[model samples]
Target: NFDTSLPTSHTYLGADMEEFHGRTLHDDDSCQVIPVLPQVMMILIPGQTLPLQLFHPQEVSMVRNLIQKDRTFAVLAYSEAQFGTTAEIYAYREEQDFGIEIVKVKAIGRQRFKVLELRTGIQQAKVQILPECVLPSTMSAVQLESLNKCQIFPSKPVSYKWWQKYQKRKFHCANLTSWPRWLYSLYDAETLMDRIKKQLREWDSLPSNPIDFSYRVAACLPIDDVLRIQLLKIGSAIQRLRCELDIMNKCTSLCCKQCQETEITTKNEIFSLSLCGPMAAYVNPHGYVHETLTVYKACNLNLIGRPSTEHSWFPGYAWTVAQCKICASHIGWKFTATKKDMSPQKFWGLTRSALLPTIPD
Candidate 1:
């Protein structure tokens, strides 16, 4: 039985996200043909960084071919195959393991696109970048004018103009009061934004541009790829934000996917360790990428291997392999700071792939 109750507890959890704004908007209708990389386990959300480990012979050739050109590819969702995000490979490395060449890539999701045509033979695709539809608020100009005009009478109001303003304001207030509790609350984006920013401290500094804000929330939440694909299809940020807020309220914990009984961590324990926020992608030396969620505490996990400082993601910290106690799957790493004065002495980095949402029936 997974607990879906909202966490009453609080925890601290990137202002650096503004740089990706230019890459997000295609602004034109012209479709472009690019390499299509189908992912079975990952959904690349816009504004999120994804690390790819190409081991297959054709996949290696695809990367090699792409490197000479734009280094941009479409990551099609294996489940949907219709929607995808354009990935721009910024960094890559080649390593030989067991006499087999492997390519590791660091790609950031730039824009969402719709698969117009697919050539499975060479894994090439023609896709059109999806544009964000910023919906206007339901509150009309008259409603806003009335509300603003009525604000002058905060203390008291009895004059004819004041009474008229009050009556008009009352009329507009009726529009809101008539809504269902859930409908009203779900669409209350300002309140939801406040609640979200308070939960994760990193959000406090994020740009309030609704499109990016919604994507940031969507990328960070420990939700299923099915739900994430749905979010990608939502063209409006307001709608996406509403959906994300609903999901955040519904999920209470992250449990081991292999053995659901092993509760790994609760929602409140998640906090930001990087400028990218609590959930961010980090690549390993072997070229595998782990979308990690940093947390204050994690349980039903055991640490193995000696703590090593080499290739540490965080300076002054050493990491030890963390695995699920029940299934022994590599979940993530337990990072410990060597210096006594270090801010976070110890923290757990749980990979998003190893965790499942604890939702109510």
Candidate 2:
């Protein structure tokens, strides 16, 4: 049985999502598509948002029109697919002539829309979009052809019936949450309900009892948009919880997919952290943008300095340099507590460039 004496933010949870007040989406439909660049797999999964900057005045006009109309748009990953090189695409990339770039905005994903027609021109990519997978199971010839011709993949759709059931369950469970002390005893302790509830308690302005918690969790996950897409595809709340558990488990162990070393085993505590997003923008002091799979709570590494300012990506956090024991690679940073009440006393951060695509069971 779970504890009922603990203070909870709410007695119940239900739908307060303003976007879905009276509307529904189909698997094959139209939606506003806003193309984003420098690729790097930046995403806006449903229930989460990303910070965007558009430098072009023309681009600014596009977003302004949307605001005036009180509309929502799809945050599509836009980039030039390079076979061998990656330097060609960046958000700041632009024509050499005017050099203004594009408009900047915050992309908040509201719904999924299929591309019935993707019309990309010199202007913004105009996709004749439709909301997701609810149909009498009928097919339109044009919609079928649109799905075939489009190269980009839109987010998957969930059922209305499933969403209703999920809301009721979410309400009941989140009403009075408790931690199974055993789950957080030693192994995978931080991944338990206690930690999640603690997060809800601490995070300000975040709806304690949300209509949907999946987006909130995914938004804070340090995992990149690549792994995040898997969660976005799931519409059912239960399925998303299972998927989130799998991902949290993945972040726990970083194994070498190649060579003799499977994992960097040392006589020290190790932990992993996904930045506070399905995406994180980590800019090194030297201005190099890197995609890292940050691991937290790790020890037994060659500490570069007693104290190093390594928390540039995440402010208000202090960290030290950590190196791999086997190859002496720059694996991640060792973060230290700056305040007395810091939740994690010390944690480590690692990168994903070395790991393989395999997730161990």
Candidate 3:
């Protein structure tokens, strides 16, 4: 049997403190100031889950104390608008006029701070004593279904059964024109419950396991806060599907626009041509197509030719390939040759027209 009166087992010790000598410290009853950083402000809301990372030695000790004492600590958010520091005495004095009072010290994790001051406050003996604050309600299953049918869900999946039927029809396109076919395919693939379960499993695996690049890209589509809150509130298959659909649509649109812009830019520039084939051919004049391909594979961005001290025009060359940062796609190659008396003005005059072409209407 679980103890209803006890706090959730997930609760652990954490520290909140002021930075001193670039290290965080916590204030205790001693009021001892060892050139310590002061504790600023503390913000605590009942029934709210706050995640924290523990590091400092003092903080670790504090957390250990809390665990030993089985205490629930307050979470304090600093207020830059008023309170001078988060120390209980300062906060009490500052907010006393506002009918606010400080209560309890529950350190969750290890955090240390310089003791600025200490003040009196009521400490809650049990975590269960904290008031319950209800989170906002989530959309109902019916509401989510309606939204999904209207194409509101981003990257929504189809049922397995329906997916099979749609696949039989051989529809390959995306968007509104192909939505019905896709929806049918999803239905054919699996029941709604199975899909939801899969999503939950995937969500669970995310925090612990390493994810592939493709999975990261797919996850990036959704609005973060919305997705997180929804994940917490709505565990049903339909709701997850609806959210995924919305994300998918938005991501698809963004990708399409980016691709279009890249295509336009690349088409306008002659220098944007893929030079791997031509460079390979240049390097392996007598080699077969397969040999030429192998030569291209061996070529790297930093390939440099040997110096020809005997020639004035061709001394040595370094060939560097430029790649687009956005998609990691290869752009073009630029060759830099060592010249004894290279004049920037002369080079600019020769290449100015070619470098900056006038746009024709």
Candidate 4:
């Protein structure tokens, strides 16, 4: 058992600032770069370990080739006028009988450069080493500015679950008191934590009060990938904690970008684009998880019908699949608890299955 404290993931994202926040890109300015797939798929957040399996032979080749060059690269967030084939669709396609499977990437994120030489040849890019300038909230600006002065170093990888198990005294001290009881009611988090403990013995403790609480919660969540990226971008621990918990505990309101031809008006909390399940391992009904955001709270969606059946993935409730009112394509499912007092008396699970591949100019 390794007993060592770690530099949190936020620190990971804050380290990379050798240009490329989509600012001016002159011919002279360059760093090792990873191609941002035009299509939206898996996103990498700080404090998270993204295991990328290179199914494509060329992709595998790229990494093997890079052993000689600078070992790391820059991640660039993909930007388009709108959302497209979600990270979920590609994740699901990887296993279909038809033999269609997409892949994953990063560089649209925190953490930084490898080299000044820019290249996107083959399936991967080899980056050169460069200066850093970032720190997550736990660490301050002096830390971030200092990041550039010294070569950024990788932190040790410790399991959140392992740390919790190893640090039992601290685990026992966690508190969810001021947090409204209603928050626990949603998704039965009260019980969900219990369930996680059963599945991950050492990983089962409550969120620690002081140290990097945001990353701890983020680590435990069934976080949609895009959401992970969002959490990674947030520099502050409390801000990240509040931002995520608020979404889970409160009624989240969202406008369909497709609905822009439809509805589009809310100050809007940036929701991490999520899809349930991992791209690797397989599950039957549960295998494909779309962190499908949205719920039964309220919306102007064109209901498929008032009465419906078991969408299956979500049980203990009745769901009426919904379509974009304007687009008439499957977008989400809303469920009303068949059992009274169930946490999510009504909740929504939206899919990006039909999200357009279209993006803005």
lDDT of each: 0.69, 0.40, 0.25, 0.36
- The C-alpha TM-scores of every prediction are 0.74, 0.46, 0.22, 0.37
Query: Which of the numbered candidates is closest to the native, going by highest lDDT?
Result: 1
* Model 3 global lDDT (CA atoms, 0 to 1): 0.25
**On residues 48-91, what C-alpha lDDT tens digit does candidate 4 reach at each position?**
33323234545434433332233233333333211111111111
In model 1, what lDDT does residue 229 have?
A: 78
Q: After superposition, which runs of candidate 4 have C-alpha atoms over 4 Å from their true positions? A: 1-42, 47-76, 80-122, 126-206, 209-211, 216-252, 261-289, 294-296, 305-320, 327-330, 335-346, 351-361
Candidate 2 root-mean-square deviation in Å: 15.1
Please report how far candidate 4 places residue 108 from its true position, in Å: 16
Give the Cα error of residue 81 in candidate 2, in Å: 9.5
Worst 10 residues of 1 by lDDT: 6-15
Tens-place lDDT digits, model 2, residues 214-327: 556665554443565565555544445446656655554454333424564321222223324222334443223344444444434678877654424443356677676666
Cα-lDDT of candidate 2: 0.40
Off by over 4 Å in 1: 1-31, 37-41, 51-71, 89-106, 141-188, 202-204
Give candidate 4's whole-model lDDT: 0.36
Candidate 1 vs candidate 2: the lDDT winner is 1
| Best-matching candidate per TM-score | 1
Output the better candidate (1/3) by TM-score: 1
